[PDB]
Amino acid sequence: AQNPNCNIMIFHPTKEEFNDFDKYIAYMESQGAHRAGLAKIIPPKEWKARETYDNISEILIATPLQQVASGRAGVFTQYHKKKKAMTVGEYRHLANSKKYQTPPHQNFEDLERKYWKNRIYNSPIYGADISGSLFDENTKQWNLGHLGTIQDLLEKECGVVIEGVNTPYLYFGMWKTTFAWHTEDMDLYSINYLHLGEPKTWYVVPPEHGQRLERLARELFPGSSRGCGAFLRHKVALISPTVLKENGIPFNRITQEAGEFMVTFPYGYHAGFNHGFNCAEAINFATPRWIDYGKMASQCSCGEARVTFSMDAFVRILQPERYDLWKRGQD
Ligand SMILES: O=C(O)CNC(=O)C(=O)O
Ligand SMILES: [Mg+2]
Ligand code: NI
Ligand SMILES: [Zn+2]
Structure with missing residues (x-):
């Protein structure tokens, strides 16, 4: 068996x-x-996503989200408070302000320490889940807006044509902006490209240990868990690496820099944070192995997780027994 210790691999x-x-995902x-x-x-x-990032300031972040934490430094939840719209130019200025900018630090490790120590005491603002793409239309390789769609994959594997579309999302981040512990919708893969700016640190649990x-x-x-049998679908819970180590949970960590892709694999729980002002683009995708x-993905039916139009058909076709209850959650 290849990679039996489940280490994060880096490809060139x-x-x-x-x-x-x-073919490369399969490799x-x-x-x-x-x-x-x-x-x-x-x-x-030789590759580039686009020629320059000099003309992105007029992109609108219609609903910036202020990420407010509750709990203790290593074990907390976050809720998203909606803020007034602002442009990417306005957001970048805010990220760089004294209130929100990355503190002085020695290296990634020092910054990670400062994140886990101090995250709960601040409420950074995230421009998340913005439909759109920064890939040039002429970039032919690994263009996240030109991938084969999950609907076409289900059709090719299973023979059923379904409604739905699959498009990328932009994330504009600042220091301490946080992605809670989750797997993807329907335990899909994701791919994430860091187009510009400061790094993104990731933590991941091997799928076999999810x-x-x-x-x-x-x-x-414990209260969240009683409210919903799949509450990690709510994407609100954070657990630090210190706490995972204390409880024997297997995981790994890696820092993504500008110009690099990350791929998350089915049922790979992940969480992380942004080091400073940045812009990432991400999209879900599928393969035959998905x-x-x-078919086995958990679902949130308590009503909190509320998801895209296109997840309907996935549940309907792959999880017909669950479909009724799940759709009650959506309506
Ligand atoms: O970049 C982020 O905030 C979160 N991204 C992901 O969880 C992903 O790409 O799967
Ligand atoms: Mg612009
Ligand atoms: Ni994700
Ligand atoms: Zn739920």
């Missing part, structure tokens, strides 16, 4: 190997990359 495809996305899996739950892909030196994370989370968030995960 050549320009030739960067042509066929599906990574042949080397065991999926066992970690997350891989890093460094694009060939249930260990879930059991810890039920112990650490289908079995989609």
